[PDB]
Design a protein around this ligand. Structure first.
Ligand SMILES: NC(=O)C1=CN([C@@H]2O[C@H](COP(=O)(O)OP(=O)(O)OC[C@H]3O[C@@H](n4cnc5c(N)ncnc54)[C@H](OP(=O)(O)O)[C@@H]3O)[C@@H](O)[C@H]2O)C=CC1
Ligand SMILES: O=C(C1CC1)N1CC[C@@H](Cc2n[nH]c(=O)n2-c2ccc(-c3ccc4occc4c3)cc2)C1
Ligand SMILES: C[As](C)(=O)[O-]
Length: 610
């Protein structure tokens, strides 16, 4: 049986502080290191404590143990955390193509080769070129086995000098200089910038002076350890723009920077109009093949806008590199809504970063990011309650119905606009009824408030509504050039409107609701060419679930990859799509058990082709 990649999808601020605070081991090791340093002036077997104690016994000691030091948990803490992935994925999302050329500076003591390829490897489409470099060839000798496994190329580069020609036009430069010394930082960073293509990223990991870890190390080692202000001043000096910042509770820091690109005048298009008239406008804008002006889609008046999933899909289409977006999405009504009109200081900052995804949520700018699901028992259902599957006669719908029945559901309402149309559907319904399950086939349409209200009423007769499942879908596939507002309306009706209506009706009339679940897609989460409308519709459903959960209502969006055995896509299982395999229904149903038992608002499941 195949093993899916299971992730949570979370709003992630660009700037995060106090990272790794939950980790007891690091908090415990820091306290110890602080005590040892205090002793010199006046877990325990980790490299930094062992080194300090040796100092307590007393350069010869320090020099000997230096290669071992970067792998100390405190020194490597941010690196073995979701902060690293967040930064990398931001870079990836802002690449003009599926290729990313990566060069590691001072790899000998940096050790990013043992993390970055492996973190990006589960990406099904990404073409990674990774070169580990250092000043001396001897520096990378002990890592050869690791480098070989990950297909990491090698290079000679002392950052005090300009980069060799081979390493230039890089998309991403990475450096862990927590232990490794850059030498003169200004000169080092200057050469690093030159090695980047315009729009390329720099990812620096380091220790901050004026914070415990950095101060502890600086003491031990008496160029050098720098303050945060010093680093940020250096970035400005070499024309780098800081677009990401992750700081641990002990003062280790990931700086994500970007080399700017000369910017043509941006085109602003509001995508809030309910009639989808902006579609026609956007088609005209993209139709200009010659134009290199970036296209900035603005969602400002609707927190449930699907612009994010829209953008993901349009980025995969011709002229997609031009696309950017801004989304204002407060979960709290009390939160301030910033002004992002063209004159504004808030908008200027965003334009300077030039990031594809700019989402404002409750006081912070950031973007939605994927993270490996930590959680990695079978659920059961209240047998007296009624359960509703919109699109319940479909491929996934019939399997979900079976699944629910297995878990005790006796009362089901399956909605479909045109009712039973296949022999398979007819047989399953009859069989379930024979088994004693109350199964109602409804034509009530959640696309309208009236239809949503009638549907709940129909379910309420069988029993109180315990669960709603939105599997309704209508597809209007095609590149944006061949799209229309009407087609956008058709695709959004079962999903955006359906979920808005279900949200409202269940709020008003379903106080015993335990489950509110929508089936999203990787088309929204990752992007699929020719499905921008579908990307939008799904994205909007996710936004709604998030708002609900903030208010303490049930809400869950599942981003499914290709589904096997049954469904639109199969209508097969061995058919590779975008480096992924269709997930066998049996695998899907096991994942659902896990997902229903989950605190997170938006989840993701897909299967990688080996
Ligand atoms: N199949 C796949 O590979 C994947 C599926 N998706 C998601 O999974 C879910 C189920 O997909 P799948 O089973 O493959 O699709 P199917 O086409 O097999 O079934 C979906 C059903 O939705 C019904 N429907 C459409 N609009 C409405 C409406 N307004 N009210 C009631 N019913 C409606 C349709 O029937 P009728 O026309 O009679 O109304 C249709 O039978 C969807 O939400 C989809 O986005 C996610 C990832 C990949
Ligand atoms: O929703 C539907 C059906 C109901 C309409 N789907 C069918 C397959 C998929 C959309 C699609 N069609 N063709 C095609 O190649 N895809 C696809 C696009 C992207 C990714 C994918 C997955 C994980 C990833 O992680 C990082 C990047 C990335 C990309 C997988 C598949 C959904
Ligand atoms: C769907 As049950 C109620 O778990």
């Amino acid at each position: 049986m195949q093993v899916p990649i299971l992730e949570k999808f979370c709003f992630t601020p660009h700037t995060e502080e106090g990272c790794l605070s939950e980790r007891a081991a690091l908090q415990e090791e820091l306290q110890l290191c602080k005590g040892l340093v205090q002793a010199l002036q006046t877990p325990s077997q980790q490299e930094l404590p062992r080194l300090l104690s040796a100092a307590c016994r007393l350069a010869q000691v320090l020099a000997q143990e230096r290669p071992k030091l970067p792998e100390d948990p405190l020194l490597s803490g941010l690196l073995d955390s979701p902060a690293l992935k967040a930064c990398l994925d931001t870079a990836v999302e802002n690449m003009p193509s599926l290729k990313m050329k990566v060069v590691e500076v001072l790899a000998g003591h940096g050790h990013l080769y043992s993390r970055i390829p492996g973190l990006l490897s589960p990406h099904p489409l990404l073409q990674l070129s990774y070169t580990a470099t250092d000043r001396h060839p001897q520096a990378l000798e002990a890592a050869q086995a690791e480098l070989q496994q990950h297909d990491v190329a090698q290079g000679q580069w002392d950052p005090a000098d300009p980069a060799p020609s081979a390493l230039g036009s890089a998309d991403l430069l990475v450096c862990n200089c927590a232990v490794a010394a850059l030498g003169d930082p200004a000169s080092a960073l200057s050469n690093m910038v030159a090695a980047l293509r315009e729009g390329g990223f720099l990812l620096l990991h380091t220790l901050l002076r004026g914070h415990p870890l950095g101060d502890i190390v600086a003491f031990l080692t008496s160029q050098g350890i720098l303050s945060q202000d010093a680093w940020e001043s250096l970035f400005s000096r070499v024309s780098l723009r800081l677009v990401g910042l992750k700081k641990s509770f002990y003062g280790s820091t990931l700086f994500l920077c970007r080399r700017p690109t000369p910017q043509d005048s941006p085109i602003f298009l509001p995508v809030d109009d309910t009639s989808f008239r902006w579609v026609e406008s956007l088609k005209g804008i993209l139709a200009d093949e010659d134009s290199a002006r970036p296209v900035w889609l603005k969602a400002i008046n609707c927190a449930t806008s699907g612009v994010v999933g829209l953008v993901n899909c349009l980025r995969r289409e011709p002229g997609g590199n031009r696309l950017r977006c801004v989304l204002l999405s407060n979960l709290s009504s009390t939160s301030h809504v910033p002004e992002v009109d063209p004159g504004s200081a808030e908008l200027q900052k965003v334009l300077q970063g030039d990031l594809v995804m700019n989402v404002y949520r409750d006081g912070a700018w950031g973007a939605f990011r994927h993270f490996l699901l930590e959680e990695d028992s079978k659920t059961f259902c209240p047998a007296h309650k009624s359960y509703i599957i919109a699109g319940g006669l479909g491929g996934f719908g019939l399997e979900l119905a079976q699944w629910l029945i297995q878990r005790g559901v006796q009362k089901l309402v399956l909605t479909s606009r045109s009712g039973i149309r296949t022999g398979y559907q007819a047989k399953q319904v009859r069989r379930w009824r024979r088994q004693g399950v109350q199964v109602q086939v409804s034509t009530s349409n959640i696309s309208s408030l009236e239809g949503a209200r009638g549907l709940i009423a129909e379910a309420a007769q069988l029993g109180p509504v315990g669960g709603v499942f939105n599997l309704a879908v209508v597809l209007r596939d095609g590149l944006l050039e061949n799209q229309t507002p009407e087609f956008f309306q058709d695709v959004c009706k079962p999903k955006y409107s359906g979920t808005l209506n279900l949200d409202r009706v269940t709020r008003e009339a379903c106080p015993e609701l335990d489950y509110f679940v929508v089936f999203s897609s990787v088309s929204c989460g990752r992007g699929n060419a020719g499905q921008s409308n579908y990307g939008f519709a799904n994205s909007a459903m996710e936004r709604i679930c998030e708002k609900r959960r903030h208010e303490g209502l049930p809400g869950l969006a599942v981003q499914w990859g290709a589904i096997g055995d049954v469904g639109i896509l199969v209508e097969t299982n061995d058919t590779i799509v975008s480096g992924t395999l269709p997930q066998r229904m049996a695998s899907c149903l096991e994942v659902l058990d896990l997902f229903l038992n989950q605190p997170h608002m938006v989840l993701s499941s897909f299967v990688l082709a080996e």
